[PDB]
Design a protein around this ligand. Structure first.
Ligand code: M7G
Length: 175
């Protein structure tokens, strides 16, 4: 019948899974495939301003696990921005909307995004694949900056560098 005709969900290009890691133990929590489902889920998850300290919240394409060791992420890396503790909610949102909406030019390279809640600063990173494709990675980083109205340099860290050099990994590109 008509019920599902006049209130038809609007499907996204990809399915996305939110994962959480709480203050190899990163649980998935909600998978969505439609706009409706996104908002439903985003409106029942805490925004970064009300997350607990040291929490990580991930939003990755379905079947990409948010781990350096995932074979889609393995040769990839991450653009990172910083915001003050408690002032990262809009950035997170604008980031989610940019990804699920397929707004990035080089959106093929996009794996997902993560907000890291820390005392002092919040960080949001976008994870991509093909770290060695500078042209692509620079496109994404610039464009993210433009989406966010961010006015500072951002950097990109190969997952291979992160794995090897924990604290000490340097940015390979900057935009
Ligand atoms: C994001 N991530 C972090 N780790 C490891 O877990 C640690 C968690 O560090 P953090 O909690 O990201 O920041 P903070 O400790 O400065 O507050 C990192 O230093 C990495 O050693 C990770 N280990 C794996 N295998 N995969 C991941 O995606 C990953």
């Amino acid at each position: 019948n008509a019920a599902s005709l006049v209130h038809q969900p609007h499907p996204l290009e990809h399915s996305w899974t939110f994962w959480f890691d709480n203050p190899a133990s990163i649980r998935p929590i909600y998978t969505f495939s439609t706009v409706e489902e996104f908002w439903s889920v985003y409106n029942n998850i805490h925004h970064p301003s009300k997350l607990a300290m040291r929490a990580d919240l991930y939003c990755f394409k379905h079947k990409i696990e948010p781990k350096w060791e995932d074979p889609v992420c393995a040769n990839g890396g991450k653009w990172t921005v910083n915001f003050p503790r408690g002032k990262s909610d809009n950035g997170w949102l604008y980031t989610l909307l940019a990804m699920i909406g397929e707004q990035f030019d080089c959106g093929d390279e996009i794996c997902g995004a993560v907000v890291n809640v820390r005392s002092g600063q919040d960080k949001i990173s976008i994870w991509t694949k093909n770290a060695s494709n500078e042209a692509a990675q620079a496109s994404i980083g610039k464009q993210w900056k433009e989406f966010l109205d961010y006015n500072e340099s951002i950097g990109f860290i190969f997952h291979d560098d992160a794995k090897k050099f924990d604290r000490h990994a340097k940015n390979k590109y900057m935009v």
